[PDB]
Design a binder for these strands. Sequence first.
RNA 1: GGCCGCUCCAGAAGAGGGCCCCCUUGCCCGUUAUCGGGGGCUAGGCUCGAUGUCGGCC
Lengths: 228, 214
Amino acid sequence: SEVQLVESGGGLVQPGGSLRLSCAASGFSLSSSSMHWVRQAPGKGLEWVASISPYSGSTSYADSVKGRFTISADTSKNTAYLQMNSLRAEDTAVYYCARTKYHYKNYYWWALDYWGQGTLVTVSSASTKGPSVFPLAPSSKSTSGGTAALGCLVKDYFPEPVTVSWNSGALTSGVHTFPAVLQSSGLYSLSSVVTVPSSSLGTQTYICNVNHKPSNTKVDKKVEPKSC
Amino acid sequence: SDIQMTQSPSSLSASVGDRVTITCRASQSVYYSVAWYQQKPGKAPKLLIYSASYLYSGVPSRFSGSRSGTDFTLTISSLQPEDFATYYCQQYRRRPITFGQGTKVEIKRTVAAPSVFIFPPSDEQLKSGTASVVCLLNNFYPREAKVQWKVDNALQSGNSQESVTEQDSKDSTYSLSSTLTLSKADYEKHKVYACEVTHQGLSSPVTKSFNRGE
RNA sequence: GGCCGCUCCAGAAGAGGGCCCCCUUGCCCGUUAUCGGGGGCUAGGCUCGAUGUCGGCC
Ligand SMILES: *[C@@H](C)[C@@H](O)CCCOCCOC(=O)CCCC
């Protein structure tokens, strides 16, 4: 409970750009550890990036970051750093800082025994853009067993994230907001849907509330059935 | 020359109390230098096992690890509710360290067929020059499903994207969207837009469709 | 046929080097760092050694 690792410095950068990540450690001395950066691209596995032994200054790097990335440590601050230059879209990931405890009785470094909370790095040339919100309307055709489906298509925003509620949070049962997909344009898109009783369609109002903090946008869209 | 770590299966379903085994194969011998990590969504991995079979401090004893040649297994003797998660193996016999791609342990439940809905593009979107056609698969189990787009009975390829929710916290089902993205021009070149769904819960594929205009 | 050698030729010639496997690091060891022992291979391609089918002397 005493060992802590606090990552910071993540953010959004254009291809070719730089970021410096910081990993502030407490509960142990960096000189009695091997410190690491391991990244996890959205929906993918863990990829080791770089390791450092602050006691000796020895470093190692994944081939794909050699020359671009530099790992370092300031023992006076008990903090490790990852300087990331020439960033590209494929570097987009959560970056975790992790520790291996040194054991003088052992003979080599063992596993990654403690991991920080991670910091998000996004590399994109896309410009910040609020979503266009389009209705996913129920029609009289598509009523299945007393159930209608409707929704909102939240298209072409950047970056992540968008939040969606329904009826200002009064409607929560049956709501599914799908994970965003990165389109080939570099913009994101997702749908949020809800199933409701079909008999309700004439006497209930269904509004999706879409928030995109990076563009400071809040959009409310009434979704109503098309007739005839 | 790196050592690869190959994990199978990519996911498995189990119930509380089941014995669960997760396997990982090293591309060549890593002696006994393998670790196992648990990761929950949005959270950092935690070390469970190191040196193939040694429990890390504080890890419950229902977790164990074993080795047969290059095959490494993580076993949970009686799965608990906090054990639904993704598990990763990793070798450290040789630098660079390498990870398997993970095994997600998910909640087993009774088969559930999807309810399927198709949505034409809104007139608002068409005015902007694009036409997204959305097909919805709602609250189905298991995760495996095949979604086929047909335009004027022509099978589509390359112009759709799928997105799938995590298991519902209440009923353990999945929901899935498949979105067919055409230009306004292409969308007006055709009449019949059809989404065809195959799933274990359905006796035969279900097709929802509409005619543009109508 | 002797002696002295490897400058040249030969591969007839064995170590270095390189790959794989077992032993939970297992005589002793171990760079804040993965060893050691055993096993299975790789030869004339580089280094060193050795040799003569080679060179020099008599
Ligand atoms: C040296 C002791 C070792 O090579 C001799 C063993 C015989 O096996 C085949 C020769 O080994 C090599 O291939 C060495 C190549 C180095 C360039």
